[PDB]
């Protein structure tokens, strides 16, 4: 009955829904990442604001693939921007996504994951449209419910899900808040980062296992906070440096 238990039970139920409903899509996404690695392509992940947190969770990560890179749009990487409200305004700016993609090392055949719960703003929609125009394969992590219950804020009238090769449904109901209290007018307690981080790890774990099953040793990193982790990782980062853009 207490709020903590209600929230955690809501988050568990959402993870169960992802496990039971998105198993085949997670497999397809992990397979696309493994194909891209095998074929010599690069891997990138993007999200704006709090959707950036799931993208970051798979980059330079203990237990994660060394080959996953972050596509950084300045001002929308997490909520670090001053003022934080500028992050929200930048999600509406047409042309930011193309500036960032065109400057990046992404090329035809690469894979880009785009995390956007709503999928409705100009920046993630444009990011997907322009990435596909550049020949990238695009995986979206998005709550498809928003596409029927909200209006697109992109000029095209379309949502992120309309421009993805693979769509992973992150299930969160409109409002991104799992609890209500009779005395309290706004809902509270968002689970979207819990779910998207979990979805992202399921995808990259699938990619790692798929590489392994093909006789390809997955380039996995170890935690730098267990003795010996940084030495292990140094080997891996050097080995795959050509497709890694967060170090040299």
Q: By 3-state DSSP, what share of the chain in percent is helix, strand and coil, each rounded to 5?
A: 45, 15, 40
Least Cβ distance, residue 146 to ligand 6PG (angstroms): 7
By CB under 6 A, name the one of 11, 33, 34, 48 that touches ligand 6PG. Answer: 48
Measure CA of the first residue to CA of the last residue in the chain; give whole Å.
Answer: 51
Count of residues in contact with ligand 6PG, rule CB under 6 A = 12
Q: Is 118 in the site for ligand 6PG (CB under 6 A)?
A: yes
Q: Is 152 in the site for ligand 6PG (CB under 6 A)?
A: no
By CB under 6 A, name the one of 6, 28, 50, 232 that touches ligand 6PG. Answer: 50
Q: Is 91 in the site for ligand 6PG (CB under 6 A)?
A: yes
Beta strand 43-47 pairing with 111-115? parallel
Q: Is 138 in the site for ligand 6PG (CB under 6 A)?
A: no
Please give the residues from 158 up to 177 whose contact with ligand 6PG meets the rule CB under 6 A. 176
Q: Which of 191, 227, 218 is nearest to 63 (CA)?
A: 218
In the complex with ligand 6PG, the residue whose CB is nearer, 25 or 116, is: 116
By CB under 6 A, name the one of 30, 49, 64, 218 that touches ligand 6PG. Answer: 49
Contacts of 191 (CB under 8 A, 6+ apart): 7, 10, 11, 14, 172, 176, 178
Least Cβ distance, residue 190 to ligand 6PG (angstroms): 7
Rama region for 31: left / alpha / beta (φ>0; ψ in -120 to 50; rest): alpha
H-state helical runs in the chain: 3-21, 23-38, 51-57, 84-90, 96-103, 122-133, 145-149, 192-213, 229-239
By CB under 6 A, name the one of 30, 41, 64, 124 that touches ligand 6PG. Answer: 124
By CB under 6 A, name the one of 70, 117, 195, 237 that touches ligand 6PG. Answer: 117
Contact 150, 117 (CB under 8 A): no
Q: Which of 67, 40, 113, 30 is nearest to 218 (CA)?
A: 67
Q: Is 140 in the site for ligand 6PG (CB under 6 A)?
A: no
In the complex with ligand 6PG, the residue whose CB is nearer, 50 or 132, is: 50
Binding residues (CB under 6 A) for ligand 6PG: these are 48-51, 88, 91, 116-118, 121, 124, 176
């Amino acid at each position: 009955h207490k709020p903590a238990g209600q929230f955690l039970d809501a988050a568990i139920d959402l993870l169960r829904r992802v496990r039971d409903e998105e198993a085949d899509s997670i497999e397809a996404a992990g397979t696309l990442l493994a194909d891209t690695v095998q074929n010599g392509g690069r891997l990138f992940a993007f999200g704006a604001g709090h959707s950036s947190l799931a993208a970051q969770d798979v980059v330079y990560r203990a237990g994660g693939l060394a080959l996953m890179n972050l596509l950084t749009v300045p001002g929308v990487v997490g909520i670090d921007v001053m003022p934080a409200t500028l992050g929200s305004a930048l999600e509406r700016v047409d042309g930011l996504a193309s500036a960032v993609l065109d400057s990046s090392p992404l090329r035809a055949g690469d894979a880009l994951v785009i995390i956007s719960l709503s999928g409705r703003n100009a920046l993630p929609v444009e990011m997907a449209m322009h990435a596909r125009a550049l020949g990238l394969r695009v995986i979206g992590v998005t709550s498809v419910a928003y596409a029927s219950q909200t209006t697109s804020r992109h000029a095209s009238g379309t949502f992120l899900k309309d421009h993805c090769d693979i769509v992973l449904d992150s299930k969160i109901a409109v409002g991104d808040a799992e609890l209500t209290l009779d005395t309290v007018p706004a809902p509270f307690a968002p689970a979207s980062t819990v779910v998207t981080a979990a979805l992202m790890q399921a995808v990259t774990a699938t990619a790692a296992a798929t590489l392994a099953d093909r006789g390809i040793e997955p380039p996995l990193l170890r935690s730098g906070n267990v003795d010996g982790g940084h030495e292990w990782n140094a080997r891996v980062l050097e080995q795959y440096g050509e497709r890694i853009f967060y170090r040299r």
